Design a protein around this motif. Structure first.
Motif, PDB file in Angstrom:
ATOM      1  N   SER A   9       0.838  -1.173   0.000  1.00 50.23           N
ATOM      2  CA  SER A   9       0.000   0.000   0.000  1.00 50.23           C
ATOM      3  C   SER A   9       0.892   1.248   0.000  1.00 50.23           C
ATOM      4  N   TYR A  10       2.085   1.114   0.597  1.00 54.16           N
ATOM      5  CA  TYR A  10       3.082   2.178   0.619  1.00 54.16           C
ATOM      6  C   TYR A  10       3.446   2.526  -0.817  1.00 54.16           C
ATOM      7  N   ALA A  11       3.848   1.499  -1.565  1.00 50.23           N
ATOM      8  CA  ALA A  11       4.228   1.656  -2.953  1.00 50.23           C
ATOM      9  C   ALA A  11       3.061   2.143  -3.776  1.00 50.23           C
ATOM     10  N   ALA A  12       1.879   1.602  -3.514  1.00 52.85           N
ATOM     11  CA  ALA A  12       0.671   1.995  -4.231  1.00 52.85           C
ATOM     12  C   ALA A  12       0.383   3.477  -4.054  1.00 52.85           C
ATOM     13  N   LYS A  13       0.460   3.953  -2.815  1.00 57.99           N
ATOM     14  CA  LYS A  13       0.212   5.357  -2.506  1.00 57.99           C
ATOM     15  C   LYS A  13       1.257   6.223  -3.192  1.00 57.99           C
ATOM     16  N   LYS A  14       2.471   5.711  -3.238  1.00 58.83           N
ATOM     17  CA  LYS A  14       3.539   6.373  -3.945  1.00 58.83           C
ATOM     18  C   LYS A  14       3.263   6.454  -5.433  1.00 58.83           C
ATOM     19  N   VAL A  15       2.797   5.351  -6.017  1.00 62.00           N
ATOM     20  CA  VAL A  15       2.388   5.320  -7.430  1.00 62.00           C
ATOM     21  C   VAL A  15       1.291   6.356  -7.667  1.00 62.00           C
ATOM     22  N   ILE A  16       0.327   6.412  -6.737  1.00 62.91           N
ATOM     23  CA  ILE A  16      -0.780   7.363  -6.786  1.00 62.91           C
ATOM     24  C   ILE A  16      -0.277   8.782  -6.925  1.00 62.91           C
ATOM     25  N   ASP A  17       0.695   9.149  -6.110  1.00 62.53           N
ATOM     26  CA  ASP A  17       1.253  10.499  -6.160  1.00 62.53           C
ATOM     27  C   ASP A  17       1.854  10.781  -7.519  1.00 62.53           C
ATOM     28  N   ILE A  18       2.531   9.813  -8.062  1.00 61.51           N
ATOM     29  CA  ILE A  18       3.216   9.983  -9.329  1.00 61.51           C
ATOM     30  C   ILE A  18       2.214  10.091 -10.483  1.00 61.51           C
ATOM     31  N   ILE A  19       1.293   9.138 -10.573  1.00 66.08           N
ATOM     32  CA  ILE A  19       0.274   9.151 -11.641  1.00 66.08           C
ATOM     33  C   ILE A  19      -0.634  10.387 -11.530  1.00 66.08           C
ATOM     34  N   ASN A  20      -0.708  10.946 -10.338  1.00 62.95           N
ATOM     35  CA  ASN A  20      -1.530  12.113 -10.075  1.00 62.95           C
ATOM     36  C   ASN A  20      -0.774  13.379 -10.490  1.00 62.95           C
ATOM     37  N   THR A  21       0.527  13.391 -10.248  1.00 65.68           N
ATOM     38  CA  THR A  21       1.353  14.554 -10.519  1.00 65.68           C
ATOM     39  C   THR A  21       1.804  14.622 -11.976  1.00 65.68           C
ATOM     40  N   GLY A  22       2.223  13.500 -12.503  1.00 60.51           N
ATOM     41  CA  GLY A  22       2.695  13.439 -13.860  1.00 60.51           C
ATOM     42  C   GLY A  22       1.574  13.575 -14.860  1.00 60.51           C
ATOM     43  N   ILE A  45      -1.065   0.310 -17.147  1.00 58.98           N
ATOM     44  CA  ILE A  45      -1.356   0.497 -15.754  1.00 58.98           C
ATOM     45  C   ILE A  45      -1.552   1.984 -15.471  1.00 58.98           C
ATOM     46  N   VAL A  46      -0.661   2.814 -16.015  1.00 57.40           N
ATOM     47  CA  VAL A  46      -0.728   4.275 -15.849  1.00 57.40           C
ATOM     48  C   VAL A  46      -2.073   4.833 -16.333  1.00 57.40           C
ATOM     49  N   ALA A  47      -2.436   4.492 -17.566  1.00 56.04           N
ATOM     50  CA  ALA A  47      -3.663   4.976 -18.186  1.00 56.04           C
ATOM     51  C   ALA A  47      -4.885   4.563 -17.381  1.00 56.04           C
ATOM     52  N   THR A  48      -4.902   3.312 -16.966  1.00 60.04           N
ATOM     53  CA  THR A  48      -5.997   2.783 -16.198  1.00 60.04           C
ATOM     54  C   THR A  48      -6.064   3.459 -14.822  1.00 60.04           C
ATOM     55  N   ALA A  49      -4.932   3.495 -14.135  1.00 59.60           N
ATOM     56  CA  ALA A  49      -4.840   4.053 -12.799  1.00 59.60           C
ATOM     57  C   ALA A  49      -5.279   5.511 -12.749  1.00 59.60           C
ATOM     58  N   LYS A  50      -4.840   6.330 -13.715  1.00 65.81           N
ATOM     59  CA  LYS A  50      -5.243   7.725 -13.705  1.00 65.81           C
ATOM     60  C   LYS A  50      -6.740   7.873 -14.016  1.00 65.81           C
ATOM     61  N   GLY A  57     -11.338   7.493  -7.578  1.00 68.97           N
ATOM     62  CA  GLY A  57     -10.499   8.249  -6.694  1.00 68.97           C
ATOM     63  C   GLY A  57      -9.155   7.614  -6.459  1.00 68.97           C
ATOM     64  N   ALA A  58      -8.266   8.403  -5.901  1.00 70.23           N
ATOM     65  CA  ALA A  58      -6.897   8.026  -5.601  1.00 70.23           C
ATOM     66  C   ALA A  58      -6.812   6.795  -4.704  1.00 70.23           C
ATOM     67  N   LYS A  59      -7.616   6.781  -3.668  1.00 69.24           N
ATOM     68  CA  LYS A  59      -7.619   5.694  -2.699  1.00 69.24           C
ATOM     69  C   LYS A  59      -8.130   4.390  -3.336  1.00 69.24           C
ATOM     70  N   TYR A  60      -8.975   4.527  -4.344  1.00 65.14           N
ATOM     71  CA  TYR A  60      -9.497   3.375  -5.029  1.00 65.14           C
ATOM     72  C   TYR A  60      -8.385   2.716  -5.797  1.00 65.14           C
ATOM     73  N   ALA A  61      -7.669   3.525  -6.547  1.00 64.95           N
ATOM     74  CA  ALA A  61      -6.612   3.039  -7.378  1.00 64.95           C
ATOM     75  C   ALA A  61      -5.505   2.470  -6.551  1.00 64.95           C
TER      76      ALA A  61
END
Length: 64
Positions: A9-22, A45-50, A57-61
């Motif tokens: 979930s740590y990594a996931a939340k980190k991915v979230i920040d990146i896909i959200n910012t980029g 994964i990026v396209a789907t996640a964003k 929402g972010a928490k969902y992804a």
């Protein structure tokens, strides 16, 4: 992310920040891969996640 990639979930939340910012998919892929240390988060994964963070929402992804 956690479920499909099999990451923490740590990594996931980190991915979230990146896909959200980029913005650009290629840009995000490079950043996420650098953070997670794996080529798990691909363009698909990026396209789907964003898109998931847009609707659900972010928490969902994060869980996804």
């Amino acid at each position: 992310l956690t479920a499909n990639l099999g990451i923490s979930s740590y990594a996931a939340k980190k991915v979230i920040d990146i896909i959200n910012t980029g913005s650009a998919v290629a840009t995000i892929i490079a950043l996420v891969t650098a953070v997670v240390g794996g080529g798990l988060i691909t363009a698909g994964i990026v396209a789907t996640a964003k898109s998931l963070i847009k609707k659900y929402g972010a928490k969902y992804a994060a869980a996804w």
